[PDB]
Paper text:
Bacillus subtilis BsDyP belongs to class I of the dye-decolorizing peroxidase (DyP) family of enzymes and is an interesting biocatalyst due to its high redox potential, broad substrate spectrum and thermostability. DyPs are a family of microbial heme peroxidases that display structural features analogous to chlorite dismutases with an α + β ferredoxin-like fold.
The variants from the first and second round of evolution, 1F9, 3G5 and 54D6, showed similar kcatapp values for DMP, circa 2-fold of those of the wild type. Noteworthy, the kcatapp of the hit 5G5 variant is ~7-fold higher for DMP, indicating a synergistic action of the three mutations S325P, A330V and K317E in the functional transition. The crystal structure of the 5G5 variant belongs to the monoclinic P21 space group and four monomers in the asymmetric unit were identified. The mutations present in 5G5 are located nearby the heme proximal side. S325P is adjacent to the heme proximal histidine ligand, H326, and mutation A330V lines the cavity at ~3.5 Å to the heme. In the wild-type structure, the side chain of K317 is at the surface, located at ~10 Å from the heme propionate, but in 5G5, E317 is part of a region (309–321) that is not visible in the electron density maps. Therefore, the replacement of K317 with a glutamate disrupted the salt bridge to D250, hypothetically leading to loop 2 destabilization and structural rearrangements that resulted in the higher flexibility of region 309–321. The results indicate that the variation in the loops’ flexibility and the widening of the active site entrance in the evolved variant 5G5 negatively affect substrate binding, as reflected in higher Michaelis constants, Km, but simultaneously facilitate electron transfer from substrates to the heme, as assessed by the increased catalytic rates of 5G5 for DMP (and also for ABTS).
Numbering used by the authors:
A (entry chain B): 56 to 111, 117 to 308, 322 to 414
B (entry chain A): 56 to 308, 322 to 414
The structure:
Amino acid sequence: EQIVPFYGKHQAGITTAHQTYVYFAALDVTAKDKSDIITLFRNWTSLTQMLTSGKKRNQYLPPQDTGESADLSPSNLTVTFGFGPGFFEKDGKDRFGLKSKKPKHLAALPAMPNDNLDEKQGGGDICIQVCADDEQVAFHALRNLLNQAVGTCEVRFVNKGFLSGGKNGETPRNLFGFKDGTGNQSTKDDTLMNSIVWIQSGEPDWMTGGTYMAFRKIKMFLEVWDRSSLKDQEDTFGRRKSSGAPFGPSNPHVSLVKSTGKQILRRAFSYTEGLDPKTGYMDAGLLFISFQKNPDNQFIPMLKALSAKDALNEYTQTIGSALYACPGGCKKGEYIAQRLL
Amino acid sequence: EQIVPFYGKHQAGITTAHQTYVYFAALDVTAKDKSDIITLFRNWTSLTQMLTSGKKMSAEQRNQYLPPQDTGESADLSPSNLTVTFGFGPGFFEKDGKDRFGLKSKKPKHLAALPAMPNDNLDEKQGGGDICIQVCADDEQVAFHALRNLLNQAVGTCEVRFVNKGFLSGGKNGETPRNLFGFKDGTGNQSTKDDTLMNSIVWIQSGEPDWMTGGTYMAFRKIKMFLEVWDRSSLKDQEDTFGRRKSSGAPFGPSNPHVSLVKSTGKQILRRAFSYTEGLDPKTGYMDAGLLFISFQKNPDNQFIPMLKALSAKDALNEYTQTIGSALYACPGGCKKGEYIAQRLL
Ligand code: HEM
Ligand code: HEM
C-alpha cells in the first residue's frame, strides 16, 4: 500500500522517502484572533489524516472534497507544516502572543551578494509542503487544504516541482544531468538524522521532534548550461557527470560545500514553468529544500561559502528565499502545533 | 517495456494510450530556405526515434571540449511510453499574406485559424504557432527531457512561441481519468482500438494533399477553469452544469448542460486533453489552472467547429471557464522507417 503514516513522533515528508512531485505553498495569516488559527490547524490535521490514510452527501452543499483524486491511490502522500518569522512578529507586533515560543534560529536568511530575491516569492507566515508520487494527488491535497484556509489566511505563493529517481533505484538527476542527493546521510539511520535534522532540546517544547526548513528558489540557466562543454560542466561541480565520482576566480561546487564541514538534509525538487517572458527561454530551476536542526550552524555557513566562490553561480541565481520552523510530530488525538494553546 | 513505436502508418500520441504528462510547445519558423526546414525535421526524426525507444546517448570516447549531445537528466529513466507528435499551423503556409516555402499547393483543406467565439478572451501569444510539438510520457522528467533536447536542435531555424505542460492521472484500476472539476473525462470518446471508428473520426484517407494521408487535424484550446468559484458551488449546481452525476457519470434529465449541448451537434472528435496548474494567478490571487484541451479530428469544419459554436452560445460551463488560447494544426501521416517526418517538404 502507498500510505505514509501521518501521526508520529515527527512530521512525515522530512525523512520520508523522496516522492516524485511536490506542491509548496506559503500563506500569510490575516485572522486577528489566535482561536481562528487553532480552528484552522485542527481542521488541517483532520483533513490531512484523511487524505494521507486513503480515506475517500448533501446535494445542496458544496463538495467537501473536490473529487479529482477519487479513483487514485494515496501515492505516499505527505503534508509538512512550518511557521515563518512573521507568524511570531509582524512589523514589530506580537500578533498572537507567541513571542515566548519563538524558536532560537527562526529569522529571515541573511542577504547574499549574488541574490536577486523577489520578496513576493519568499517568506510567509505558514508553509505547506505537499509531496506525492502522483501530481494530481499532490495538487488535490494542497487544493483542499487551501480551501479550508479561506477567511483566516491569504495564499502567498504556490510552487510545484518534480524529481524522478532511477528505474533501478538510482540517485535522481537534477536538470543539469548530475546525480543529486549523494552527499545526504541515510534517512534510515535514526542516529544520523537525530544529529543533523531532529531537535531534541534547547528549543520551545513544540519544536521537540521538529526541525528547520530552508527554502531557496534557484533559477537554472538551462540554455547557457546546454551550450557549455562537458569539461566546463564537470569543472563546475568537481564531479564527473555520469558517474558522480570526484576527479582531480571560483571553486567547484561540491568541494566548496564540504569545506564548511557542515551537513544538512537536502530534499529538493526540479521545476519547469513555460517560457520565461523576459528571456524567451525555458523557465526552470531547483526548488531547494533542506532540513537542519540549527540553520545558523549548518545552513548559513554554506550560503556564505557558496555565495562567494561557487562556480555554479555562473549558471544559477536565487530568486526566492524562506526559512520555516517545523513543529514536532502530531500524536493521534492531537492536532498540528498544538502548542498554540 | 514501456516503449511506443515511433515509426508507423500514423504518428504516435494520437490513438496511443493516454499518458500521464504532456509538454505542448509551439514554434515559429524564422528560417527563409525550405532546405533548413528539411534538415530540422530530419534531425527531429532521428532524435525522436532514439528518445522514444530504449536507446540512450552513448558518447563514451567523446570530446570533453564539446557540449554534451544529450542534456543527460533522463540517463537512468525508462522511456515511459514517450510519444512525440508534430503538426503544422496555418502560419507555416501563410504569414502576413506571403505564401511561404512554395508550399501553397500542399496546404490542407481545413487548415485555418479557428473562428472567433463570443466568450473568447484569446491571448494571441498563447495560441497559434507554425509548428506544434506534443510530448507525452508517464514521467514528467522524461517528457521535459525530450522537449528540451528537441527544442535545442531548433536554434537558428525556429523561435519557441510557448511551452505548456499538463497532467492527467487515470484510475488505479483503469477508471476513466477525472478533470480538475472532479468529473470523469473521456467517456464520450470512441474506442481507440476500433480501427473503423478511428478511420471515420480521426484518420484521413483521401481528399487532402498526400502528406496528410494517415494524418489528422489537432485542435488546441487553453481553457482556464475557475476552481475557487467551482469549489464554492453546490454539488447540484456542479452536476447541473454537465447534466451528469459527478461520482458515477450517469446522465440525468439561457443555459444548456454541457454534455447534451455537445451531443446536439451529432458530431464526434477524439479528445486527448490534460489538466494544468501554474501557481497563483497574479491577476486574481487564486490558483491558475485549467484544461489543455487537445482534440483530433479528420475534418474540423464538420466535427469541431460546430461544437465551438454550440458551446459558446448556451453552455452552462461558460460560467466556470474561459478560453484564453487557441490553435489548429495539421498533423502529417506516420513516418516510415527510412523516411523523416512530413518529408513532403521535398
Ligand atoms: C541549482 C542549485 C544546485 C545544484 C544544481 C546543486 C547540485 C549539487 C550536486 C550535483 C552535488 C553533488 C552530488 C550530491 O551530493 O548531491 C551537490 C552537493 C551538495 N550541495 Fe548542491 N546544488 C545546488 C545548490 C545547493 C545549495 C544552495 C546548497 C546549500 C546552501 C547546496 C548544498 C549541497 C550539499 C550539502 C551537498 C553535499 C556535499 C557533500 O558531499 O557533503 N547545494 N549539489
Ligand atoms: C474545461 C473545459 C471542459 C470540461 C471540464 C469538459 C468536461 C466534459 C465532461 C465531464 C464530459 C462528460 C464525460 C465525457 O464524455 O468526457 C464532456 C463531454 C464532452 N465534451 Fe467537454 N469539457 C470541456 C470542454 C469541451 C470543449 C471546448 C469541447 C469541444 C469544442 C468539448 C467536447 C466534448 C465532447 C465531444 C464530449 C463527449 C460528448 C458525448 O457524450 O458524445 N468539451 N466534457
